[PDB]
Structures are given as C-alpha cells and as structure tokens.
C-alpha cells in the first residue's frame, strides 16, 4: 500500500479513477468510513460511563484501541488526495513573509482539520491515563531487566494511593463529560462537508444526526467481531460473556432502526418537495447505472439489524459474528452511494457522466486495512487488554460466586 501511495503522490492524481465531474470518490469515501469506525471506543468508554453501565468494564480497553488505530488511518486521506501535499502546512494560520497571509475560517474542510486533530489528541491522553495502574502491575513482574526498564518508563510514578485514586476518578469523569460532545461535534463537522453544499441530493439538514447514528451502528458492528475472536484466542471468555455480546447486538438493533427512519424521512420530503432536481436524484439512486450499489446498501442496512428481535438469532455468537461483518459492507456503500450518485447526475445534462476506480484507488484502501491490523495485532501482545483497576471494583459486586452466596 505504501508503494502505491508514493507512486501516486510522485506521479499524479490522474493515475486515480477520478473524473473532471467526480472530484471525490474512494478517497473521501474511505476517509469518512474510517472516521465512522473510530467513534465506537469513545462511546463505550464515555457514554456507557455516563449511564453507569457496569458491563462496559470488560470492553473499554480494547474499545480504545479501536479508535487510536482507526482515526490514524483516516488521517492519511486528507493528505494523500491533495494536489500539492508538500505545501499542506499553509493550512495553519502561521505568521509569515507574505504580508501575514492568513486562511479563511468559513470552510468545513478547515473545520475538519480542527475537529480531527483535537478529537485524536484528547482521546490519546484519555485512554493513556487509564493505563497507569495496569502498567504498574506489569513493572512489578519484571521478569527481565529489559522489561523491568520498559514498564518502569511506560508507567509513571503511579504508587496507587488514596489521594491518587480520588483524583484519578474525578479526572475520568470530567473527560467523559467532554468526550461525548466531541463524539457528536466531530462527526457533525465531517457531515457538513456535504450538508452545506448546493448540490441536489447533498444539501440537507438531516445529516448532522444521521451520519452520527450510522457511525454508532458501524462502529459497534466492527468492535463486536474482534471481541468474538479475541475471547477465544486470548482465552478471556470468562470476561467477555454472552451478555456482553447480546448487549452489543441490542444497541446495534436500536441504531439500525434510527437509520431506517431517516431513510424514509428523506424519501417523504423528496416527494413532498416540489423540486424536480431533488426528486430526480432519488430516482437515479433507485434506478440507474449504480442501482446495485444503492439496493445492496439498502438490503444490508434495512434487514441486518432486524434479525436481533428474535432471541434465537440475537443470542448466537455464530449468527451475530456473520451479521456484524455484513453491516460494515452495507455502511461502506452508504458512504459511496451518497457521494457518487449525487455527482455523476446533476444540473446541466451535458455534464452527466460515469465513474470507475483504478487499481491504485483500491490498493491504497487495502494498505490502510493492512496497517490497521499491524497496529492492532502488535497491541494485543504488549498491552494489558483488560483494565485491572476496573474489573477488581466489580468482582465482589457481580459474578457467579458472590451472587450464589447472596441467594443462600
């Protein structure tokens, strides 16, 4: 993948399958797809916290890994697609020799720079702070002088004390409070790249909450597949139970129905509206050269979350593993369809065209997938996958020993 990136940066964007009509496709498509994935961890560790959801304690740590290794993937596309990326530093409002030449502050592309760079920055210190009592439990093993040194450096001087824990708890409460607003506002700023346009099929007001609901939906679908294989490879199935799996399935079901409502909302309004251009855009999606993208997208998003109403399907690690994978396919098309079907058909029939990607568009995407797994796979062999400070506060409150004691 790196080879493909270098090639297209050094030889030209024209090596991609982009058109004079369709300026965006697969580059920003994959950008927003990775961004959507990287909201799962910030929900699990902040929203479930705010709603006192005890079961999150066995997930939080791996959920954080999911965002720090996916936001990073997304961060490549804002640079790679640029025409002259070595001049990217001009995006920042830095005093200079051009008569203090500045940037404007009206474009959502700039808003996105602030949204993504601060989203990542804040989440990095959040999950890192939570590692202090877990690295402490590894430096105290010190099986080799090398590892001894490593964990004595990775951990700070965290001698767990009354006062230290008191402050620790308060910090995590504050950051969770700040994190939920970031989850919403960051994806909303991304959403406004299309909502603020003049293009029929893009201009709307539903996107700011709509894309967010989709982000939750696709994010949890991803997380659920890794937890399913994790609990067998790492042998941590005593911590990741069927109740954790079932609850993940329930949440996915809920947000799936929200997305469904938004689909019928757009169709109603399109009919209700007297604008021919908006109505034609929806007709193009229903019937046109990309009909298969639209209908396969709808098939996945409409029916997949509805199987969860049946307990016999919901309470099945086999069935839910498969469905969780399917959801990500449908959501990739969700992003693809909106961008492409709205550009190859618009104002002035003479400008109507098609679109087909090239091997270097495909290759870069493959590269980001490969990199994701390199980072995540290495993570699983060096980091404490389950927070000890968290689990040990619930071991007495819940578990198949103490409950039996309470019953007799």
């Amino acid at each position: 993948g790196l080879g493909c990136i270098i090639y297209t940066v050094s030889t030209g964007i024209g090596t991609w399958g982009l058109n004079k009509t369709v300026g965006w496709a697969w580059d920003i498509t994959n950008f927003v797809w990775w961004v959507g994935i990287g909201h799962a961890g910030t929900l699990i560790s902040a929203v479930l916290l705010l709603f006192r959801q005890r079961w999150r304690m066995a997930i939080n740590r791996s959920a954080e890994a999911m965002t720090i290794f996916s936001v990073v993937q997304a961060g490549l596309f804002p640079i790679i697609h640029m025409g002259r990326p070595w001049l990217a530093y001009w995006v920042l409002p830095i005093p200079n020799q051009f008569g203090s030449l500045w940037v404007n502050f009206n474009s959502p592309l700039l808003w996105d720079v602030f949204a993504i760079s601060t989203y990542l920055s804040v989440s990095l210190v959040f999950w890192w702070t939570g590692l202090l009592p877990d690295f402490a439990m590894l430096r105290d093993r010190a099986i080799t002088p090398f590892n001894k040194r490593v964990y004595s450096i990775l951990s700070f001087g965290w001698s767990g004390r009354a006062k230290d824990w008191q402050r620790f708890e308060e910090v995590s409460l504050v950051l969770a409070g700040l994190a939920t607003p970031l989850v919403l506002s960051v994806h909303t700023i991304v959403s406004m790249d299309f909502a603020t346009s003049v293009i029929p099929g893009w201009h709307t007001t539903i996107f700011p909450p709509y894309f967010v609901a989709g982000a939750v939906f696709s994010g949890f679908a991803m997380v659920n597949t890794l937890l399913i294989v994790m609990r067998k490879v790492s042998n941590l199935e005593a911590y990741i139970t069927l109740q954790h799996i079932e609850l993940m399935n329930i949440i996915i079901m809920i947000t799936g129905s929200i997305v469904g409502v938004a689909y019928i909302t757009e169709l109603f309004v399109a009919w209700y509206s007297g604008v021919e251009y908006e109505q034609y855009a929806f007709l193009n999606r229903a019937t046109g050269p990309y009909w298969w993208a639209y209908w396969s997208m709808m098939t996945c998003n409409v029916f997949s979350p509805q199987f969860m109403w049946f307990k016999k399907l919901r309470t099945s690690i086999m069935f839910s593993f498969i469905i969780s994978i399917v959801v990500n396919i449908g959501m990739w098309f969700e992003r693809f369809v909106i961008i492409v079907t709205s550009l190859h058909r618009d104002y002035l029939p003479s400008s109507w065209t098609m679109f087909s990607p090239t091997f270097v568009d495909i290759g870069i995407f493959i590269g980001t997938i490969g990199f994701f797994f390199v980072l995540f796979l290495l993570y699983s062999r060096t980091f404490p996958v389950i927070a000890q400070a968290e689990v040990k506060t619930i071991l007495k409150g819940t578990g198949d020993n103490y409950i039996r004691e309470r019953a007799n």
């Binding site: 030209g12 640029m82 002259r84 500045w102 940037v103 700039l110 065209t353 098609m354």
Partner: protein
C-alpha cells in the same frame, strides 16, 4: 536548490521599430487555396503570436478556426529545413541549374512543360506566370482543387462569361430556401455567417426564416427553422418542382407526395417574397446550377448580384483529367508544382504516379516531405506565409497585400523567386511586387496600403443573356439514378483538407455536431442501424464504444470503418463520410489518425452508391459529450415562437422563479439573509450571449485557448473524459420532434410507476429532432459556491465583479469543482509541460514560441478557469490612464478575444456602469435571462431566448 542564474542580452544594434515589452501589429492576408481571410498579426520583440482580425473598412473575411490554429505550422519542427535533389540534400544553386537545364532540353526537344497550382488570386503572380509562358513556347498552366466545384463554375461561365462564384448576401433576403446548400459550412468558401445571423434577430416583428432540404445533417440544418430529410434523387426533383412554381412552367416532376406537401409550400412562399428571397443549392450538376440562376433572376432579389464576383475557386475537372491522361499517354517534360498534392487527394492517384514515372525533373514545393514530395526529383523548401511576400484579390473589386512577419526560419525559397530566376529577371519577388504595385494602387504606394493592409477597387455587374433554362429543367427532371444505399463526402470545421494533418489544436478540437475528437467516422441513421445491426454505447468509464463496418463500391472497398449512429444524421438510405485524414508521410504515428476516403471521390463526385456490411470488432472513441438529449429542463434553454414573442407578455415566455413570503409571491432574487457589497461604481462587467446568433460558435473556442496556454491532451486522457477546456459548446437533441414535446410528457406524469419509464425513454432522441446550441463558460457569480469552501483561500472576488483565481495558494483539495452547479472547472492531473508522455508543442524547444509571456503556465495540482480577460483589460485601463482619458465605448469589447474573435455578433463583452456601451443596452431587454436563478448564485453572464418560428 541553489536557484539558477538568469542573464539578459540587449542589442548591439537596436532597430527603431522594436521596443522591449511592446507588441507590434502587422497587416497581412491569407489564402492557401482553400481558406482565406484578412487579418492582423500580433508580434513580440521578434516573432508572431495569436492572430487578430483586420477590420479597417474591409472586414469582409474574418478568420475561421482553421486559420486561428494555423500558427503552429510556422513553428513546426517537422518541416523541410533544406531542399533535396534526387533524394539528397542540395543547394538552391543546384536546384536552379537543374531546372534551367531541363527547360533548355524541353525547348530543344519540343517537349511539354506544365506548372501546377491552386487558385492563385494574385495580379502579380499571374503576370509572372504569363511572362514564364511568354518566354517558354510550350508551357501550360493548370489548376487543381482537392474538393472541386467546377459544375457551379460552368453554369456561371456559360451565362455571364467568367469562371467565378456569386457572392450571395444573406442579410438581404427574408426567405432562404436551401437544397443541399450548407452555406454556414465550407460551401464555396463559406463566409456567410454574419450575413445569416444578422437576419435572425427579432428587432421588430420580422425575422428571416430558413428551409433546409438535405441528405446529411449540418450546421445550416441545425440553424434552420424547417428541415426535410431528403435523398439526392429526391432533391433534384424537388428543385424542378420549385422551378415550376416560381417560374411558371409545366415539367412532370416525380416526387413523393409527402415531400411535395412541403416543397410546394416553400416554393410558393419563396415566390411570394419577390425581391426578398434566395434559392441556394449544392447539387453537383451544371443543369441544377443553371436552374438556380434562372430562379434567382426571376426573384430579382437583393441578395443576388454579379457586381462583385468571387475569385477564390477557379478549377476544372475536365482539364485535370486531361492532364493525368497525357502524363501517361504522351511524353511530358519538366513539371513544376506548388501547393498541389494529387497523391492522396486524387481518387485516381495510382495512375498519376505511373504518369510521374514517365516524366523528367519533377519539382514540388512544400513544407513537408509528403507523399508527392517523395515521388519526385526536387523537394523544394517553401516558406510558411509569414515568411513570404504577396498580394491577394478575394473578390472582384479589391486588392490586398501580404507582409512577412518573421525572418525565414529554415532554408526556403519562394516559388515566384524561382520563376524570376529562370525567366532571367534580376532582383526578387518583393522588388517585382514593388514595380507592379503602381498598376493598381492609385493612392500612396506603401504608407497607406501596407500600413492598412487593403486597397479598394471599383467594379460593375456582369451582363446576362438568353439561355434555354426550360430545356435544362427537362434534362434535370429526366435525370434519374434510383438504386440502393449511397454516401456523401464532406469536410469538417476542424479538418478542411490535409494542410492540418498534424495540427494538435485541430485534432483536439471536437466536432461541433457530433462532439468527438481525434478521429474520423461514418454517419449512419438509426433507421439504417437497425437493419445493419450497428450501434454505439456508453461504457463504465464514461466514454463511448461502437461497432465497425465495411463500405463496398463498384470494384472496390474500405474493409474497416468506424460508424457513429447519428439518429437524424442521414435522411434514409444515405451515409455520411468525412474526407481528409489518412496521411502517412512525414509525421508521427500519434498524428497518423483517421480515414482518407479521397479514393472514393470518383470522377470528382461527392455522391457514391455503396454497400454497407457489419464488421467483427468494437472501437473506442475519444468522445467529449455524453448525453444526447435535454431532459425537459426548460430552465436551461428557453425557447418560444415569434408570434408569442410579438403578442404575449414576457410573463408567458420569459418567466422568472418566484418564492413565497407571508402568503405572497416575490421574485426569487429578492430573498437574501446576507448583505450585498457595493459594486455600483468602478467598472462592473458583464457578458452577453444571444442564442439566435449562435450558429456553431466554432472559432470562439480556439481563440480562447490562444492566450491562455491551455495544453493539448491526447486521445487517451480525453477518452476518460478528463480534458482541459475553458469554454464549451453544447448539443441538445429532443424526443418526438420538438422541445415542447419534451415538456408535455413530463408535466403530465403519474406516481412512481410511469416516472420510472418516461425518464428512461427521454434519453433516446427520436427521429428528425430539433438541435440547439449553448455556449457555457464560468459565469463569475456573486454568491459563488466555489468560493466559501476553499480552505487555503486561493479564490476571491474583485470590485469589477470577476472571480480571481490565484495559482499559488491552490493546494489541490478538489472541493471547488464540486460546488459549481454549472461545473466548469478544470483541474490538471499530470504535468503537461516538458515530459515525454505529452510530445506535443509544449515539449519541443522550437515550438514554445506560441506561448505568450504574459500568462503563466501551470504545472501540477492547481485548477484553472475561464476568467474574464484580465490580461487585456488591465492593459486597456493602463493605456487609458497614461494618456489621461476615459475608456471609450467599444474599447473593452475589442480586447477580450472571447468576444473580439467570434464571427457573428453573438458574444458581447464590455462595461455596465458606463450607460452608453453595447452591454448596457442589451441588459435592459425583455429577453433578460440567467441560468438557474432558483439556485440564487447571481451570475454575471446572461443569455437571451431562442426565438425560432
């Protein structure tokens, strides 16, 4: 990197006429045997750049697109830099001695000497040729045309007495009846654009309507009000039917009843418009041409006159045939030719070559070692127009001079200089011209003639006479050849003949009708396509593919042609075929593209009987435009009829969009949450298209790509629909024969079961639809969506009202190509400047002189856009500020070449706050109209209305 060292070289001896940084203009003319014009050459400190039009009281022949792109032939590195003799590089003294000694031998033996040329309308060149003949006892001078018109010449000669063409004035007639005319094309050196367009403007309740009868489909058909598909066997009968009505006569015309239903109507109307009508026809038969003369005399119309005949076409298909025969039959000595290319243009060139094998001392003058330069004795290196001296008489009453603008690049020698040296006349052709200039110029010699470019000469009408036209009518009506499928050969606006075989601007320039580039093709109607199973299709990458086909004729065939199924293209039973692409000598394989078809021009006839068969494979096309039809979007091209224009209020034909307020309606332009900026003082600009004057707007494209240094992209990278053009001409067909028929199917619609089928049928254009053109460029908006989203702030607006595009902060995050709803914004993808993937004129060192130094050349990743003419209007304000004046009325209009180079008065540029300009009188009109007012973007370019009837 250290950054290079720049040096500067002043003159040892500086000439008075040259000032560094100051452009100079020269008055020259052009005539290459096919195209002709009066023009100005803008030059730099030593060299010519973009061609301008000469309008000093002789603005009769403006330059076309082919002429505008002709500058590339000057700076073509693939030119014969040195003359050759017997295949080897030689001196001109060797050439001179060879020719002189062969002439001496021909005289001694009593042989044949023949000079070949093409329509040298030149008093002094013709005189010089006459002197050659006077000195040489056995010299014949013969004229050879590629595309011939000798039938028209014979008809005129035998009535009035000379071989010349009638220069019709289309602005002095109300009814135009055209039978195979194509006067807006290359018909007789078509320069009738302005004349036609002038009568298409509804100044009052008047408008000249046009009746088109034709087999093919052309621009005059698209610009017609009525169009009747008709084969050549029907057209001849229709002409006689017209004759019988205008001229009372009884000739037994055999013609289809449905055709008679329209032919009779047109003829009766033509007859009614006495002195205000015109019959024009392009039937290759002297008898048909004679009937046209008879009818126009009967009409006695203002458009018909012999006072100023056209001297441009003076060939003969009988003389040329005799020449060819004699070369093979008898013994022909030294033959010298200039600008003549029988091998490749002559259908019988195989016999011509066998004739060449029997002659001695073949001398050919050219720019390239072409197919005839190859089969010859002496390859002479000719100069390229701007490297030579001359004089041209286009019409009967005019005289003009041609100045060289650049000193000879290569080792060339003028044809006339050669004639002078063999005649024994001292000096050169320039001196010869000086000596013979006083014979015509009664005024000041050079100072008032070379300076201005032209000289006016009086003339008089030709006497007519008695002639049995009734006999001719019966001969035409008796004439009949009704068989099977036939084809008609034609020329293009981008490809007149083989003088632009390797011209990248004309190769890239897309066809104004079919919207394709870099290739030849065959035009087949859809009714025929269904019989031959031929077709075209849009593929996944956006371009076009199509089937192959074979054309078979009597004793011959082509075996591989590329058909394009143009629905109304052919009437029925006919095939269109462009002629003039298959060249192979002295050019690169990137330019060796297309089909010649001259081999099918048997006996110089454009109409041939053929058999069409389907081939095996599939061809890929570099097609520019995708969709053929207009979806019923009346908010793009608004059209109406003349009686509606005259009797109904603007609310019924030019209606603007309304928006609801407090239960009230108001013009959409009044709704605005923001505040406007003050552009009431200081030169607010606009730009004005009227759709009636838009015939094809052909030469408006090439002039805009002349300053702005837009690079040339090959067949691939345009095949993927990724080309670079700043302004474009559109092409919108219809379904069910009208544009109002594509607004009755749409407004009458049902719910979701019929609307999935009507919108899928409205992209298949029906038989014989209506055509409409529309020029689309970047109208510089005021609430511009392309502005607000640029993160690096490379775009902004001025007080004048442009859209300023900086090429510096544009770090190519490609947003602003998306929020343009008109979507005219061209990102560049590769580096087009100096790499070997693009081996066009931007690469080589000799061909980087067309590029003007005032506009920068883009590299990679930056977008470009059809800006207003900033690099001219910043100089018009400059030249009006140093003097201490106010800018004049028509001074902004003459500088911006988007408007100052179009043929008709379609494009109008200028000021608005000046209330006495040409724009301010057009903006206050009942046809005031913008594209997409419901978007609310406030454009600065407004179209009017099509007012067809």
């Amino acid at each position: 990197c250290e950054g290079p060292v720049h040096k500067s070289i002043p003159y040892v001896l500086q000439p008075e006429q040259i000032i560094p940084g100051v452009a100079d203009y020269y008055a020259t003319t052009v005539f290459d045997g096919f195209d002709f014009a009066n023009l100005l050459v803008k030059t730099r400190e030593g060299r010519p750049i973009k061609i301008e039009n000469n309008t000093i009281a002789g603005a009769k022949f403006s330059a076309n697109a082919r002429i505008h792109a002709s500058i590339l032939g000057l700076y073509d590195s693939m030119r014969l830099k040195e003359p050759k003799l017997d295949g080897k590089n030689s001196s001109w003294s060797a050439v001179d001695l060879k020719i002189k000694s062969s002439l001496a031998d021909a005289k001694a033996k009593g042989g044949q000497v023949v000079l070949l040329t093409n329509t040298l309308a030149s008093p002094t060149t013709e005189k010089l040729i006459g002197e050659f003949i006077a000195k040489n006892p056995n010299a014949k001078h013969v004229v050879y045309d590629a595309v011939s018109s000798s039938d028209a010449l014979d008809a005129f000669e035998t009535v009035y007495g000379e071989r010349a063409l009638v220069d019709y004035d289309f602005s002095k007639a109300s009814l135009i009846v055209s039978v195979g005319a194509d006067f807006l094309g290359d018909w007789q050196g078509g320069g009738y654009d302005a004349g036609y367009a002038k009568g298409r403007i509804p100044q009052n309740g008047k408008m000249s309507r046009h009746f088109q009868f034709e087999s093919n489909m052309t621009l005059s058909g698209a610009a017609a009000d009525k169009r009747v598909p008709m084969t050549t066997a029907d057209q001849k009968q229709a002409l006689v039917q017209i004759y019988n009505i205008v001229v009372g006569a009884s000739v037994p015309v055999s013609l289809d009843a449905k055709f008679k239903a329209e032919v009779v109507k047109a003829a009766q109307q033509l007859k009614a418009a006495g002195t205000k009508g015109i019959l024009v026809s392009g039937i290759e038969d002297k008898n048909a041409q004679l009937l046209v003369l008879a009818i126009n005399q009967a009409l006695a119309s203002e458009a018909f006159s012999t006072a100023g005949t056209r001297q441009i076409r003076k060939g003969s298909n009988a003389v040329v045939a005799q020449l060819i025969k004699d070369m093979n039959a008898g013994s022909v000595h030294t033959l010298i030719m200039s600008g003549v290319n029988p091998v490749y243009t002559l259908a019988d060139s195989a016999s011509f070559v066998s004739g060449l094998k029997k002659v001695k001392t073949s001398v050919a003058f050219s720019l390239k070692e072409d197919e005839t330069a190859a089969v010859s004795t002496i390859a002479a290196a000719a100069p390229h127009y701007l490297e030579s001296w001359g004089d041209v008489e286009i019409t009967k009453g005019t005289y003009s001079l041609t100045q060289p603008t650049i000193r000879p690049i290569f080792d060339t020698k003028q044809f006339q200089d050669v004639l002078l040296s063999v005649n024994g006349t001292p000096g050169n052709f320039y001196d010869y011209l000086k000596a013979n200039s006083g014979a015509i110029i009664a005024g000041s010699s050079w100072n008032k003639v070379l300076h201005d470019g032209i000289f006016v000469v009086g003339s008089a009408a030709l006497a007519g006479g008695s002639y049995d036209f009734a006999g001719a009518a019966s001969l035409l009506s008796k004439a009949k050849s009704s068989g099977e499928l036939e084809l008609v050969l034609y020329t293009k606006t981008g490809m007149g003949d083989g003088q632009h075989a390797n011209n990248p601007w004309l190769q890239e320039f897309p066809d104004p009708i079919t919207r394709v580039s870099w290739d030849n093709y065959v035009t087949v109607s859809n009714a025929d396509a269904k019989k031959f199973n031929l077709s075209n299709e849009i593929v996944a990458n956006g371009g076009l593919n199509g089937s192959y086909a074979t054309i078979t004729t009597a004793d011959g065939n082509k075996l591989e042609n590329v058909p394009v199924i143009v629905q109304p293209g052919q009437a029925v039973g006919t095939v269109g075929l462009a002629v003039g692409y298959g060249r192979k000598a002295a050019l690169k394989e990137e330019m060796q593209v297309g089909i010649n078809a001259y081999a099918l021009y048997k006996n110089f006839n454009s109409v041939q009987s053929i058999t069409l068969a389907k081939a095996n494979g599939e061809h890929e096309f570099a097609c520019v435009q995708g969709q053929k039809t207009l979806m019923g979007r009346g908010d793009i091209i608004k059209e109406t009829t003349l009686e509606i224009f005259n009797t109904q209020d603007a609310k019924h034909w030019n209606e603007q969009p309304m928006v609801s307020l407090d239960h009230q309606e108001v013009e959409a332009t009044t709704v605005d949450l923001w505040e406007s900026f003050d552009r009431t003082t200081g030169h607010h600009f606009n730009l004005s298209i009227d759709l009636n004057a838009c015939t094809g707007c052909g030469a408006c494209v090439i002039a805009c790509h002349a300053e702005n240094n837009v690079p040339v992209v090959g067949k691939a990278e345009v095949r993927r629909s990724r080309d670079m053009h700043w302004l474009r001409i559109d092409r919108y067909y219809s379904s069910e024969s009208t544009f109002e028929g594509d607004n009755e199917r749409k407004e009458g619609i049902a719910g979701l079961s019929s609307s999935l089928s009507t919108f899928n049928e409205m992209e298949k254009p029906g038989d014989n639809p209506q055509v409409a053109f529309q020029p689309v460029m970047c109208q510089h908006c005021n609430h511009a969506p392309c502005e607000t989203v640029c993160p690096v702030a490379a775009t902004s607006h001025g007080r004048q009202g442009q859209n300023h595009m900086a090429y510096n902060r544009c770090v190519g995050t490609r947003y602003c190509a998306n929020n343009c709803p008109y979507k005219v914004r061209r990102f560049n993808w590769f580096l087009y400047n100096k790499n070997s993937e693009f081996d066009y004129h931007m690469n080589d060192d000799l061909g980087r002189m067309v590029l003007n130094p005032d506009v920068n050349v883009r590299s990679r990743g930056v977008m470009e856009k059809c800006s207003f003419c900033i690099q001219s209007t910043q100089a018009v304000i400059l030249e009006a500020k140093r003097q201490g004046r106010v800018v004049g009325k028509d001074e902004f209009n003459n500088a911006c070449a988007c408007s100052a180079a179009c043929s008709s008065g379609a494009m109008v540029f200028g000021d608005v706050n000046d209330k006495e300009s040409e724009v301010a009188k057009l903006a206050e009109s009942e046809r005031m109209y913008h594209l997409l007012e419901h978007v609310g973007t406030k454009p600065n370019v407004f179209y009017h209305v099509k007012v067809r009837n």
